[PDB]
Amino acid sequence: SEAQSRIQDADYATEVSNMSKAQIIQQAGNSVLAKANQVPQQVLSLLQG
Amino acid sequence: QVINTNSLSLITQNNINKNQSALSSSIERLSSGLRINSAKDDAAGQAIAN
Amino acid sequence: TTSKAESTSDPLAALDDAISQIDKFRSSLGAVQNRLDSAVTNLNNTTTNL
Amino acid sequence: RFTSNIKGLTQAARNANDGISVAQTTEGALSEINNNLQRIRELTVQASTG
Amino acid sequence: RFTSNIKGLTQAARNANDGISVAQTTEGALSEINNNLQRIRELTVQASTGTNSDSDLDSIQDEIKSRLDEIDRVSGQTQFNGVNVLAKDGSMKIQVGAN
């Protein structure tokens, strides 16, 4: 039983940190997506319209 | 200088998509408590556990 | 039309073989899943670049 | 030609996603069958005793 | 003469940009192939251990073969405008000048 615990039963410390990092990177990617989408209208300003 | 068809926001979307799989796997692993939930992980370890 | 049935000769070994077969099928499906995931990633990168 | 290529590749990506879905469904069913055979093995081990 | 030169230079600039693009595509394909080979190496490092039954070796070999078949499919599959970048050991020339 102890042996089977060594293959199953993922040690929580690794994936809690992995989840925190993944969520942080996801939020960062969302922010970068919004900010990059915020760019194009520079040409609209360039048109004087 | 072009309208969003050469946009690098596509690259941002791609990176978000790659991160989404890791996020989902992390949450599912956290909920289950088992390292292997299906054979998409190490199938040999799953057979050994069985 | 009817034959008297006694038992299985080796009840445990046959069940172990069935477990082995089902585990091998698990492994095949898991490999297919991982390969499909890699294909999806490839296709996303290729369509972005193109 | 590039537009044709990108449209086809996107649609193929969705098709691969559907393939992953069907693989997941089959694997879940097989996992449950695995549990059922495991309990059958429990019962066999108990019943082999005299 | 100057008009001819500038027109040729603009065309060469677009050609060089197209070359950069095709290089990017090939690089992405190679990156993913190398990722798959990295997974192969990890699986082999696991499989070298002697604490495994032959069923474990069979499953590991099955997944290794599947992932190698993915390598082959991606290698023969990636194309850029009717040209397979990874199918031949050839050379691809880009005109970047006016002459």
Side-chain angles (χ1 to χ4, degrees), chain E residues 22-63:
Chain E
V22 76
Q24 291 186 359
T25 301
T26 297
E27 181 178 0
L30 268 297
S31 69
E32 293 179 353
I33 300 169
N34 189 358
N35 176 358
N36 268 332
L37 261 63
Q38 183 62 255
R39 177 50 173 194
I40 301 305
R41 174 156 163 63
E42 183 178 1
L43 287 177
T44 300
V45 176
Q46 173 167 293
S48 179
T49 305
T51 77
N52 289 320
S53 179
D54 291 331
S55 71
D56 313 328
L57 269 297
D58 273 338
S59 297
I60 288 173
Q61 171 56 60
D62 173 318
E63 65 183 1

Side-chain angles (χ1 to χ4, degrees), chain C residues 20 23-24 27-28 30-32 34-36 38-46 49-50, chain E residues 21 24-25 28-29 32 36 39 55 58-59 62-63 66-67 69-70 73-74 78-80:
Chain C
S20 178
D23 268 19
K24 214 172 300 282
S27 177
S28 174
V32 176
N34 272 346
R35 180 155 196 257
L36 278 180
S38 195
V40 168
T41 292
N42 183 257
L43 207 45
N44 272 340
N45 274 347
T46 300
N49 271 341
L50 294 175
Chain E
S21 179
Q24 291 186 359
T25 301
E32 293 179 353
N36 268 332
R39 177 50 173 194
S55 71
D58 273 338
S59 297
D62 173 318
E63 65 183 1
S66 183
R67 297 292 299 274
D69 268 15
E70 181 65 26
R73 196 281 310 276
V74 176
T78 298
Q79 84 180 302
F80 185 104

Side-chain angles (χ1 to χ4, degrees), chain D residues 8-47:
Chain D
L9 295 175
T10 299
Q11 214 78 0
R14 324 181 41 71
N15 293 164
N17 263 345
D18 291 331
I20 308 144
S21 158
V22 75
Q24 263 182 301
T25 302
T26 290
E27 186 176 2
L30 267 295
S31 178
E32 183 178 1
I33 301 169
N34 174 347
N35 309 110
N36 272 333
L37 277 296
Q38 193 59 257
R39 177 55 172 198
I40 291 299
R41 178 158 163 65
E42 301 215 320
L43 291 178
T44 300
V45 176
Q46 182 174 302

